[PDB]
Design an enzyme around this catalytic site. Structure first.
Site, short mmCIF file in Angstrom:
data_model
loop_
_atom_site.label_atom_id
_atom_site.label_comp_id
_atom_site.label_asym_id
_atom_site.label_seq_id
_atom_site.Cartn_x
_atom_site.Cartn_y
_atom_site.Cartn_z
N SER A 61 0.76 -1.24 0.00
CA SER A 61 0.00 0.00 0.00
C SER A 61 0.80 1.30 0.00
CB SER A 61 -1.03 0.01 1.13
OG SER A 61 -2.03 -0.94 0.80
N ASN A 149 -8.87 -0.45 -1.01
CA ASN A 149 -8.16 -0.55 -2.28
C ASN A 149 -9.11 -0.24 -3.42
OD1 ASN A 149 -5.76 -1.54 -1.10
ND2 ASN A 149 -6.27 -3.70 -1.51
O1 LIG Z 1 -4.12 -5.22 -0.22
C1 LIG Z 1 -2.90 -5.00 -0.09
C2 LIG Z 1 -1.87 -5.84 -0.87
C3 LIG Z 1 -2.07 -7.31 -0.58
C4 LIG Z 1 -2.14 -7.98 0.65
C5 LIG Z 1 -2.33 -9.38 0.46
C6 LIG Z 1 -2.40 -9.74 -0.84
S1 LIG Z 1 -2.24 -8.41 -1.89
N1 LIG Z 1 -2.41 -4.04 0.72
C7 LIG Z 1 -3.17 -3.12 1.55
B1 LIG Z 1 -2.23 -1.96 2.03
O2 LIG Z 1 -0.91 -2.51 2.42
O3 LIG Z 1 -2.81 -1.25 3.15
C8 LIG Z 1 -3.93 -3.88 2.70
C9 LIG Z 1 -5.35 -4.05 2.67
C10 LIG Z 1 -6.02 -4.73 3.72
C11 LIG Z 1 -5.28 -5.25 4.82
C12 LIG Z 1 -3.87 -5.09 4.86
C13 LIG Z 1 -3.19 -4.41 3.82
#
Ligand SMILES: O=C(Cc1cccs1)N[C@H](B(O)O)c1ccccc1
Length: 358
Positions: A61, A149
């Site tokens: 993210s 996302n």
């Molecule tokens: O969704 C992602 C990338 C992925 C995490 C697992 C498979 S793809 N990242 C966001 B971000 O780092 O905040 C996220 C969303 C939900 C929970 C934790 C992290």
């Protein structure tokens, strides 16, 4: 590196790596504007490849900060406006719940409850239109923040439509190239695979899987050198020659909404500096960070505040990253690891380091 930086970094990170059982890690501290690099452990355990300053890590993210800045640059170019309704860029989104939802709401997770993840079943472009058409908001737009996302991911996709460029081409041409981030990628080229670290989840080597809006929400991979350059660029946007990019960076650090002591920017999140470390440390924990929270509109948005702790956590299944900086002090840090370890541990370590150097 000056011995003070060497010592606080090693005394903080070594214990962290041991406690969290992190296979490999790279850290950059930007002090008085200059970068200092540190690396530990393994990029590939099986092949015994060490982490180096050239190792690529999945940013997870933290990619949203690039999306926010690319969006800011499109606004600066006059291609889009955050006040524009989403439908202006996707006329096929005819469902009535979209009336009133602007690009600002998408960029800042305030559209009314768009989900954290785009479903795995969504792949085709029409699968995506169907998902958004069928989504039912829980709330009116601009009333509650729910980190998602599917929100900022759609913002990224729509923001580049006027340019006619693919999101990847726009990112390369308008952000990566101008900033000389020559080892930063949405898709890792074969020539660079030798440097692509493996992520580790429950001991298994893994890389992020393809998914809808992945490039826009969590798809960037980069080195510790390029990320330190990204931090320098965000600390001093006025040194950037490309006019619209300089403005886009500034726009991404504007304060659009407030929840508690946190302000939402485009990708970046900010708190007033000095910060209460417990506020950002406990605050980074996922189900505080991912909770539904009422927001107060900052009308109009506050231009980037130099006295701010600006940061973003990021993760993929096998990686954990963190970036934080304080414009007023020309100070920043990037922590890239190939294990997704608890957010509070990342923020605690970063704070220990920056507070010591501030
Ligand atoms: O969704 C992602 C990338 C992925 C995490 C697992 C498979 S793809 N990242 C966001 B971000 O780092 O905040 C996220 C969303 C939900 C929970 C934790 C992290």
């Amino acid at each position: 590196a000056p011995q003070q930086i060497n010592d606080i970094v090693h005394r903080t990170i070594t214990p962290l790596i041991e406690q969290q059982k992190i296979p490999g890690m790279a850290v950059a501290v930007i002090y008085q504007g200059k970068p200092y690099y540190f690396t530990w452990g393994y990029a590939d355990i099986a092949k015994k490849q060490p982490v180096t300053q050239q190792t690529l890590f999945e940013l997870g993210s933290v990619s949203k900060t690039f999306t926010g800045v690319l969006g800011g640059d499109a606004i600066a170019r006059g291609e889009i406006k955050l006040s524009d309704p989403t439908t202006k860029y996707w006329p096929e989104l005819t469902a009535k719940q979209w009336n009133g939802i602007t690009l600002l709401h998408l960029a800042t997770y305030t559209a009314g409850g768009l989900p954290l993840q785009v479903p795995d079943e969504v792949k085709s472009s029409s699968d995506l239109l169907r998902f958004y058409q069928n989504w039912q908001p829980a709330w009116a737009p601009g009333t509650q923040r729910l980190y998602a996302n599917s929100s900022i991911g759609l913002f990224g996709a729509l923001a580049v439509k006027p340019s006619g460029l693919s999101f990847e081409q726009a990112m390369q041409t308008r952000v990566f190239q101008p900033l000389k981030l020559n080892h930063t990628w949405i898709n890792v080229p074969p020539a660079e695979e030798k440097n692509y670290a493996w992520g580790y989840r429950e001991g298994k080597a893994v890389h992020v899987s393809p998914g809808a809006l992945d490039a826009e929400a969590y798809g960037v991979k980069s080195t510790i050198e390029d990320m330190a350059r990204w931090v320098q660029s965000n600390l001093k946007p006025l040194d950037i020659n490309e006019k619209t990019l300089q403005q886009g960076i500034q726009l991404a650090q504007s304060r659009y909404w407030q929840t508690g002591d946190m302000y939402q920017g485009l990708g970046w999140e900010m708190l007033d500096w000095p910060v209460n470390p417990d506020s950002i440390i406990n605050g980074s924990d996922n189900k505080i960070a991912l909770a539904a929270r009422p927001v107060k509109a900052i009308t109009p948005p506050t231009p980037a505040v130099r006295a701010s702790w600006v940061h973003k956590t990021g993760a993929t299944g096998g990686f954990g990253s963190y970036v934080a900086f304080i414009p007023e002090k020309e100070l920043g840090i990037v922590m890239l690891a190939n294990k997704n370890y608890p957010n509070p541990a990342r923020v605690d370590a970063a704070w220990q380091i920056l507070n010591a150097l501030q």
